[PDB]
Design a protein around this ligand. Structure first.
Ligand SMILES: *[B]([O])([O])[C][N]S(=O)(=O)C1=[C][C]=C(C2=NN=N[N]2)C(Cl)=[C]1
Length: 358
């Protein structure tokens, strides 16, 4: 624990926790490839359980990076191609608006206005088919980006069909296990419940609610140790022994579309490094509830660029997560909290830490 890392992490995160009233937090810094861990506060306020390196947090949409990589692995395996029509894998999707909508569009939120959330009313598989058949695009495919669980979530579900594996079994056997992420889960097992933090929303303890395509869009839970290993794997995919997973990671960091200064990968988002910090900090704000942006196709996609700020925010009702890394510097950070606090605060803290260390 080099004093420089200790000092910049504590000087940044302690005030963040105070300002945002975060009940519990874990941080990992990856520096020259090695991880350093920090924890604060409570995984469970009522039961006085501290955050530890073994505490499970809901990753929310950071899960999309696992979905993106699993899809990349399926491409590498020759099971699917991003140029394939969605209907190749879901023949029941016969409605005409689907003509021209490819797995690429699903994976990258560019299908033409699929909504952020699958409606809560969608409970059955038949409800899900009806939803997609009836959905009317606002835009031609490949023209506008609208961040959407219904888009990348469907990509994940379809990406695993040729394997015949469930999404969970595919993720376990093809991503979690080979990377030794042995405390990373789509469904938290009873054996691990003692480590599963509560999220806190308006002071109430909460966990994520079941929903359609939840696993695929926002459903992973993990520890700070496994998430540091996830960052290491994404920093250095060539050290991965499993060839299709190595390739999948590289495919997920390829640049498929540009909007403003940001590039869309599979799950991951990227900017050129050095970044303008106001560009990523301000850009991370949700503004917004719905933010439709024209995109420029990158034809063909640029393979993973080492001089990039690669990142993803995630939230559930009770949790806020952030991951960022810069491959050319062998540098990264994971921030896991059990409160959904504003994105710009996450990115500001991450930038302050990584910039001081690079
Ligand atoms: B990702 O960007 O984190 C997805 N964000 S989301 O707004 O679509 C979202 C998804 C799930 C949940 C949730 N379900 N049960 N608890 N929380 C929320 Cl609040 C938001």
């Amino acid at each position: 624990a080099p004093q420089q890392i200790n000092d910049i992490v504590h000087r940044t995160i302690t005030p963040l926790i105070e300002q945002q009233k975060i009940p519990g937090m874990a941080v990992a810094v990856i520096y020259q490839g090695k991880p350093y861990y920090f924890t604060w506060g409570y995984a469970d306020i009522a039961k006085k359980q501290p955050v530890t390196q073994q505490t499970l947090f809901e990753l929310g949409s950071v899960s999309k990076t696992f979905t993106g990589v699993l899809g990349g692995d399926a491409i590498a395996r020759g099971e699917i191609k991003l140029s394939d029509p969605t209907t190749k894998y879901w023949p029941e999707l016969t409605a005409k608006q689907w003509n021209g909508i490819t797995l690429l569009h699903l994976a990258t939120y560019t299908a033409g206005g699929l909504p952020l959330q699958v409606p809560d009313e969608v409970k059955s598989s038949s409800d899900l088919l009806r939803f997609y058949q009836n959905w009317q695009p606002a835009w031609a495919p490949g023209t506008q980006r609208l961040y959407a669980n219904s888009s990348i979530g469907l990509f994940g579900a379809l990406a695993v069909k040729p394997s015949g594996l469930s999404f969970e079994q595919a993720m376990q056997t093809r991503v979690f296990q080979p990377l030794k992420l042995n405390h990373t889960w789509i469904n938290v097992p009873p054996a691990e419940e003692k480590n599963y933090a509560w999220g806190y929303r308006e002071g109430k303890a909460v966990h994520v609610s079941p929903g359609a395509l939840d696993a695929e869009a926002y459903g992973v839970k993990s520890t700070i140790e496994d998430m540091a290993r996830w960052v290491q794997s994404n920093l250095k995919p060539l050290d991965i022994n499993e060839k299709t997973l190595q390739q999948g990671i590289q495919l997920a960091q390829s640049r498929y579309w540009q909007t403003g200064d940001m590039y869309q990968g599979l799950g991951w988002e990227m900017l050129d490094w050095p970044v303008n910090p106001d560009s990523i900090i301000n850009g991370s704000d949700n503004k917004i509830a719905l933010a439709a942006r024209p995109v420029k196709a990158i034809t063909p996609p640029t393979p993973a660029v080492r001089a990039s700020w690669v990142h993803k925010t995630g939230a559930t009702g009770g949790f806020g997560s952030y991951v960022a890394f810069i491959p050319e510097k062998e540098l990264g950070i994971v921030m896991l909290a059990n409160k959904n606090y504003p994105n710009p605060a996450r990115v500001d803290a991450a930038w302050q830490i990584l910039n001081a260390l690079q």
